[PDB]
Structures are given as structure tokens and as C-alpha cells.
Amino acid sequence: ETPSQKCEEKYKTDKISCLHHCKYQYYGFIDVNYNIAQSEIRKFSNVLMDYGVVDKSKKRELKKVMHECAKQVKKEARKDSHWLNCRTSINYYRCVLTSKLIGPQRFDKAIQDYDKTISV
């Protein structure tokens, strides 16, 4: 009924690492073609701001962190001679939460509350 409930009831067989992207495409953080442009970035940043994970003074720095992470995930994909996929979506997350602008426990708390407000 919510993205997390739908996606985890879906993956039950393998390709379980796609469970992450399945959620983030519903949130709007990653496109359905696995891409991350600035439509997805500003969607990711805004959600973090409405749920008080980051301050409004840090918005432009966080967007840029998201932007530089996106370049990296794509750069690594093309040295492996392919493009974005389930794994790149995870790496985009790992790269973003590397930043010290984001408090982990507030992030996980925000996302889990954001997820409830969506159907299906």
C-alpha cells in the first residue's frame, strides 16, 4: 500500500538489490530509467528540508553534494562500459550519506515517515 510495503512484497525472488531502487523511484529520488538529473535532486533535497534533516542555509551545498555524487556514479558506470542500474542507485545513496551535512538517524526517520504518505 506504501512504496516500502509494495516493493518488499514484490521481491519475494532474487535481484533483491533492486529493492532499494524500487523504493526511491516511488519517492522520486531516482528516475525509472535509473537516471539522476536535477528533477530527482531537487525532489530529494526538498524532502530532506520539509522533514528537517538539513537546514535551509545548507540547501545549496547539499544539492551540490547530490550533484557531485551523481557525476561519480555515472563516471564509474562508464568505466565498466555500461550505464546506471540497481547497483548505481545504491552507490548514489552511499555517496550522499557520506556527507556530514546529513544526520543518519534523522534521515532514516524522515524517509520512513515520508514513505507512509504515499500510495501505492
mmCIF file with all atom_site columns, C-alpha atoms in Angstrom:
data_model
loop_
_atom_site.group_PDB
_atom_site.id
_atom_site.type_symbol
_atom_site.label_atom_id
_atom_site.label_alt_id
_atom_site.label_comp_id
_atom_site.label_asym_id
_atom_site.label_entity_id
_atom_site.label_seq_id
_atom_site.pdbx_PDB_ins_code
_atom_site.Cartn_x
_atom_site.Cartn_y
_atom_site.Cartn_z
_atom_site.occupancy
_atom_site.B_iso_or_equiv
_atom_site.pdbx_formal_charge
_atom_site.auth_seq_id
_atom_site.auth_comp_id
_atom_site.auth_asym_id
_atom_site.auth_atom_id
_atom_site.pdbx_PDB_model_num
ATOM 1   C CA . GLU A 1 1   ? 0.000  0.000   0.000   1.00 0.00 ? 1   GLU A CA 1
ATOM 2   C CA . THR A 1 2   ? 3.044  2.212   0.543   1.00 0.00 ? 2   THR A CA 1
ATOM 3   C CA . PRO A 1 3   ? 6.285  2.051   -1.518  1.00 0.00 ? 3   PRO A CA 1
ATOM 4   C CA . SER A 1 4   ? 8.149  0.041   1.134   1.00 0.00 ? 4   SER A CA 1
ATOM 5   C CA . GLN A 1 5   ? 5.298  -2.447  1.583   1.00 0.00 ? 5   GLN A CA 1
ATOM 6   C CA . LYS A 1 6   ? 4.762  -2.853  -2.158  1.00 0.00 ? 6   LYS A CA 1
ATOM 7   C CA . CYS A 1 7   ? 8.420  -3.230  -3.132  1.00 0.00 ? 7   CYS A CA 1
ATOM 8   C CA . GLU A 1 8   ? 9.302  -5.770  -0.428  1.00 0.00 ? 8   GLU A CA 1
ATOM 9   C CA . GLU A 1 9   ? 6.221  -7.888  -1.149  1.00 0.00 ? 9   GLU A CA 1
ATOM 10  C CA . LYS A 1 10  ? 7.354  -7.785  -4.773  1.00 0.00 ? 10  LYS A CA 1
ATOM 11  C CA . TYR A 1 11  ? 10.855 -9.117  -4.146  1.00 0.00 ? 11  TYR A CA 1
ATOM 12  C CA . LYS A 1 12  ? 9.837  -12.397 -2.524  1.00 0.00 ? 12  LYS A CA 1
ATOM 13  C CA . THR A 1 13  ? 12.661 -13.871 -5.543  1.00 0.00 ? 13  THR A CA 1
ATOM 14  C CA . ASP A 1 14  ? 16.185 -12.579 -6.102  1.00 0.00 ? 14  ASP A CA 1
ATOM 15  C CA . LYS A 1 15  ? 17.518 -9.391  -7.696  1.00 0.00 ? 15  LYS A CA 1
ATOM 16  C CA . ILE A 1 16  ? 16.984 -8.250  -4.117  1.00 0.00 ? 16  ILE A CA 1
ATOM 17  C CA . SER A 1 17  ? 19.459 -5.389  -4.536  1.00 0.00 ? 17  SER A CA 1
ATOM 18  C CA . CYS A 1 18  ? 16.822 -3.775  -6.759  1.00 0.00 ? 18  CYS A CA 1
ATOM 19  C CA . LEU A 1 19  ? 14.621 -3.404  -3.675  1.00 0.00 ? 19  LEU A CA 1
ATOM 20  C CA . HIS A 1 20  ? 16.379 -0.125  -2.921  1.00 0.00 ? 20  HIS A CA 1
ATOM 21  C CA . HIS A 1 21  ? 15.774 1.485   -6.314  1.00 0.00 ? 21  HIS A CA 1
ATOM 22  C CA . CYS A 1 22  ? 12.168 0.273   -6.334  1.00 0.00 ? 22  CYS A CA 1
ATOM 23  C CA . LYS A 1 23  ? 11.514 2.480   -3.308  1.00 0.00 ? 23  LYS A CA 1
ATOM 24  C CA . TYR A 1 24  ? 13.488 5.529   -4.414  1.00 0.00 ? 24  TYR A CA 1
ATOM 25  C CA . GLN A 1 25  ? 11.708 5.690   -7.769  1.00 0.00 ? 25  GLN A CA 1
ATOM 26  C CA . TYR A 1 26  ? 8.429  5.944   -5.862  1.00 0.00 ? 26  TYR A CA 1
ATOM 27  C CA . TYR A 1 27  ? 9.830  8.680   -3.637  1.00 0.00 ? 27  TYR A CA 1
ATOM 28  C CA . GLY A 1 28  ? 11.045 10.481  -6.751  1.00 0.00 ? 28  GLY A CA 1
ATOM 29  C CA . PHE A 1 29  ? 14.720 10.402  -5.802  1.00 0.00 ? 29  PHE A CA 1
ATOM 30  C CA . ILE A 1 30  ? 15.743 8.311   -8.818  1.00 0.00 ? 30  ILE A CA 1
ATOM 31  C CA . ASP A 1 31  ? 14.133 8.169   -12.273 1.00 0.00 ? 31  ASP A CA 1
ATOM 32  C CA . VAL A 1 32  ? 12.536 4.969   -13.602 1.00 0.00 ? 32  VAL A CA 1
ATOM 33  C CA . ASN A 1 33  ? 15.310 4.763   -16.204 1.00 0.00 ? 33  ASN A CA 1
ATOM 34  C CA . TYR A 1 34  ? 17.765 4.681   -13.273 1.00 0.00 ? 34  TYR A CA 1
ATOM 35  C CA . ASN A 1 35  ? 18.950 8.218   -14.059 1.00 0.00 ? 35  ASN A CA 1
ATOM 36  C CA . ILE A 1 36  ? 19.604 11.015  -11.582 1.00 0.00 ? 36  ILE A CA 1
ATOM 37  C CA . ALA A 1 37  ? 19.137 14.504  -13.048 1.00 0.00 ? 37  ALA A CA 1
ATOM 38  C CA . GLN A 1 38  ? 18.204 17.702  -11.162 1.00 0.00 ? 38  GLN A CA 1
ATOM 39  C CA . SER A 1 39  ? 14.490 16.906  -11.213 1.00 0.00 ? 39  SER A CA 1
ATOM 40  C CA . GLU A 1 40  ? 15.345 14.000  -8.920  1.00 0.00 ? 40  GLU A CA 1
ATOM 41  C CA . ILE A 1 41  ? 17.894 16.017  -6.937  1.00 0.00 ? 41  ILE A CA 1
ATOM 42  C CA . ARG A 1 42  ? 15.605 18.905  -6.007  1.00 0.00 ? 42  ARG A CA 1
ATOM 43  C CA . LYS A 1 43  ? 12.967 16.320  -5.102  1.00 0.00 ? 43  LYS A CA 1
ATOM 44  C CA . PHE A 1 44  ? 15.488 14.634  -2.815  1.00 0.00 ? 44  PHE A CA 1
ATOM 45  C CA . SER A 1 45  ? 16.670 17.922  -1.313  1.00 0.00 ? 45  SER A CA 1
ATOM 46  C CA . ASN A 1 46  ? 13.179 19.316  -0.694  1.00 0.00 ? 46  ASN A CA 1
ATOM 47  C CA . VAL A 1 47  ? 12.025 16.182  1.138   1.00 0.00 ? 47  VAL A CA 1
ATOM 48  C CA . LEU A 1 48  ? 15.100 16.412  3.373   1.00 0.00 ? 48  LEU A CA 1
ATOM 49  C CA . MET A 1 49  ? 14.210 20.037  4.120   1.00 0.00 ? 49  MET A CA 1
ATOM 50  C CA . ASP A 1 50  ? 10.491 19.647  4.826   1.00 0.00 ? 50  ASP A CA 1
ATOM 51  C CA . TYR A 1 51  ? 11.351 16.846  7.254   1.00 0.00 ? 51  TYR A CA 1
ATOM 52  C CA . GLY A 1 52  ? 14.047 18.880  8.999   1.00 0.00 ? 52  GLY A CA 1
ATOM 53  C CA . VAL A 1 53  ? 17.062 16.716  8.197   1.00 0.00 ? 53  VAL A CA 1
ATOM 54  C CA . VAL A 1 54  ? 19.140 19.638  6.929   1.00 0.00 ? 54  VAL A CA 1
ATOM 55  C CA . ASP A 1 55  ? 18.999 23.420  7.464   1.00 0.00 ? 55  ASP A CA 1
ATOM 56  C CA . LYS A 1 56  ? 17.850 25.816  4.732   1.00 0.00 ? 56  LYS A CA 1
ATOM 57  C CA . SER A 1 57  ? 21.250 27.517  4.780   1.00 0.00 ? 57  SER A CA 1
ATOM 58  C CA . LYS A 1 58  ? 22.798 24.197  3.745   1.00 0.00 ? 58  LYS A CA 1
ATOM 59  C CA . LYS A 1 59  ? 20.400 23.554  0.834   1.00 0.00 ? 59  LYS A CA 1
ATOM 60  C CA . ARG A 1 60  ? 22.752 24.723  -1.908  1.00 0.00 ? 60  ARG A CA 1
ATOM 61  C CA . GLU A 1 61  ? 25.696 22.750  -0.516  1.00 0.00 ? 61  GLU A CA 1
ATOM 62  C CA . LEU A 1 62  ? 23.584 19.603  -0.190  1.00 0.00 ? 62  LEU A CA 1
ATOM 63  C CA . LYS A 1 63  ? 22.281 19.934  -3.750  1.00 0.00 ? 63  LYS A CA 1
ATOM 64  C CA . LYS A 1 64  ? 25.882 20.196  -4.921  1.00 0.00 ? 64  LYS A CA 1
ATOM 65  C CA . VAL A 1 65  ? 26.820 17.130  -2.877  1.00 0.00 ? 65  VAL A CA 1
ATOM 66  C CA . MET A 1 66  ? 23.945 15.281  -4.546  1.00 0.00 ? 66  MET A CA 1
ATOM 67  C CA . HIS A 1 67  ? 25.116 16.611  -7.912  1.00 0.00 ? 67  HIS A CA 1
ATOM 68  C CA . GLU A 1 68  ? 28.741 15.533  -7.481  1.00 0.00 ? 68  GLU A CA 1
ATOM 69  C CA . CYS A 1 69  ? 27.625 12.095  -6.290  1.00 0.00 ? 69  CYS A CA 1
ATOM 70  C CA . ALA A 1 70  ? 25.542 11.745  -9.447  1.00 0.00 ? 70  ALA A CA 1
ATOM 71  C CA . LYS A 1 71  ? 28.554 12.526  -11.639 1.00 0.00 ? 71  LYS A CA 1
ATOM 72  C CA . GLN A 1 72  ? 30.617 9.931   -9.773  1.00 0.00 ? 72  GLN A CA 1
ATOM 73  C CA . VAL A 1 73  ? 28.051 7.136   -10.050 1.00 0.00 ? 73  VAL A CA 1
ATOM 74  C CA . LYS A 1 74  ? 27.832 7.784   -13.808 1.00 0.00 ? 74  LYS A CA 1
ATOM 75  C CA . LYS A 1 75  ? 31.605 8.126   -14.206 1.00 0.00 ? 75  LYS A CA 1
ATOM 76  C CA . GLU A 1 76  ? 32.159 4.719   -12.607 1.00 0.00 ? 76  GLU A CA 1
ATOM 77  C CA . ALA A 1 77  ? 29.408 3.171   -14.731 1.00 0.00 ? 77  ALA A CA 1
ATOM 78  C CA . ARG A 1 78  ? 31.084 4.167   -17.991 1.00 0.00 ? 78  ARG A CA 1
ATOM 79  C CA . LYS A 1 79  ? 34.474 2.769   -16.992 1.00 0.00 ? 79  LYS A CA 1
ATOM 80  C CA . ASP A 1 80  ? 32.630 -0.527  -16.612 1.00 0.00 ? 80  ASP A CA 1
ATOM 81  C CA . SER A 1 81  ? 31.281 0.142   -20.110 1.00 0.00 ? 81  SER A CA 1
ATOM 82  C CA . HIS A 1 82  ? 27.624 0.106   -19.055 1.00 0.00 ? 82  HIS A CA 1
ATOM 83  C CA . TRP A 1 83  ? 25.127 2.582   -17.605 1.00 0.00 ? 83  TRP A CA 1
ATOM 84  C CA . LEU A 1 84  ? 23.073 3.132   -14.440 1.00 0.00 ? 84  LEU A CA 1
ATOM 85  C CA . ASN A 1 85  ? 21.264 0.250   -12.744 1.00 0.00 ? 85  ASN A CA 1
ATOM 86  C CA . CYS A 1 86  ? 20.166 -1.176  -9.383  1.00 0.00 ? 86  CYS A CA 1
ATOM 87  C CA . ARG A 1 87  ? 23.728 -1.032  -8.040  1.00 0.00 ? 87  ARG A CA 1
ATOM 88  C CA . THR A 1 88  ? 24.362 2.571   -9.107  1.00 0.00 ? 88  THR A CA 1
ATOM 89  C CA . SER A 1 89  ? 21.219 3.566   -7.210  1.00 0.00 ? 89  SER A CA 1
ATOM 90  C CA . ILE A 1 90  ? 22.729 2.117   -4.038  1.00 0.00 ? 90  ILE A CA 1
ATOM 91  C CA . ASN A 1 91  ? 26.075 3.829   -4.656  1.00 0.00 ? 91  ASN A CA 1
ATOM 92  C CA . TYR A 1 92  ? 24.261 7.144   -5.091  1.00 0.00 ? 92  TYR A CA 1
ATOM 93  C CA . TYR A 1 93  ? 22.809 6.631   -1.615  1.00 0.00 ? 93  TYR A CA 1
ATOM 94  C CA . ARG A 1 94  ? 26.136 5.640   -0.039  1.00 0.00 ? 94  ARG A CA 1
ATOM 95  C CA . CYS A 1 95  ? 27.831 8.658   -1.615  1.00 0.00 ? 95  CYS A CA 1
ATOM 96  C CA . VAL A 1 96  ? 25.143 11.065  -0.398  1.00 0.00 ? 96  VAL A CA 1
ATOM 97  C CA . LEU A 1 97  ? 25.064 9.820   3.207   1.00 0.00 ? 97  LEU A CA 1
ATOM 98  C CA . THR A 1 98  ? 28.855 10.041  3.285   1.00 0.00 ? 98  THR A CA 1
ATOM 99  C CA . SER A 1 99  ? 28.329 13.791  3.630   1.00 0.00 ? 99  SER A CA 1
ATOM 100 C CA . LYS A 1 100 ? 28.396 15.162  7.179   1.00 0.00 ? 100 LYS A CA 1
ATOM 101 C CA . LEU A 1 101 ? 25.559 17.549  6.324   1.00 0.00 ? 101 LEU A CA 1
ATOM 102 C CA . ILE A 1 102 ? 23.146 14.685  6.945   1.00 0.00 ? 102 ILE A CA 1
ATOM 103 C CA . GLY A 1 103 ? 22.342 13.162  10.320  1.00 0.00 ? 103 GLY A CA 1
ATOM 104 C CA . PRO A 1 104 ? 21.824 9.402   9.782   1.00 0.00 ? 104 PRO A CA 1
ATOM 105 C CA . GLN A 1 105 ? 19.139 8.765   12.368  1.00 0.00 ? 105 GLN A CA 1
ATOM 106 C CA . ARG A 1 106 ? 17.146 11.800  11.292  1.00 0.00 ? 106 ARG A CA 1
ATOM 107 C CA . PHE A 1 107 ? 17.472 10.715  7.658   1.00 0.00 ? 107 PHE A CA 1
ATOM 108 C CA . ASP A 1 108 ? 16.179 7.180   8.226   1.00 0.00 ? 108 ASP A CA 1
ATOM 109 C CA . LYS A 1 109 ? 13.427 8.662   10.394  1.00 0.00 ? 109 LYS A CA 1
ATOM 110 C CA . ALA A 1 110 ? 12.404 11.149  7.702   1.00 0.00 ? 110 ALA A CA 1
ATOM 111 C CA . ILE A 1 111 ? 12.334 8.626   4.849   1.00 0.00 ? 111 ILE A CA 1
ATOM 112 C CA . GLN A 1 112 ? 10.255 6.150   6.863   1.00 0.00 ? 112 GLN A CA 1
ATOM 113 C CA . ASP A 1 113 ? 7.737  8.908   7.612   1.00 0.00 ? 113 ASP A CA 1
ATOM 114 C CA . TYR A 1 114 ? 7.801  10.163  4.019   1.00 0.00 ? 114 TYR A CA 1
ATOM 115 C CA . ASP A 1 115 ? 7.051  6.645   2.794   1.00 0.00 ? 115 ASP A CA 1
ATOM 116 C CA . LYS A 1 116 ? 3.799  6.419   4.764   1.00 0.00 ? 116 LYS A CA 1
ATOM 117 C CA . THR A 1 117 ? 2.292  9.418   2.958   1.00 0.00 ? 117 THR A CA 1
ATOM 118 C CA . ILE A 1 118 ? 2.362  7.654   -0.422  1.00 0.00 ? 118 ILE A CA 1
ATOM 119 C CA . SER A 1 119 ? 0.188  5.096   -2.233  1.00 0.00 ? 119 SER A CA 1
ATOM 120 C CA . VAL A 1 120 ? 0.529  2.638   -3.669  1.00 0.00 ? 120 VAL A CA 1
#
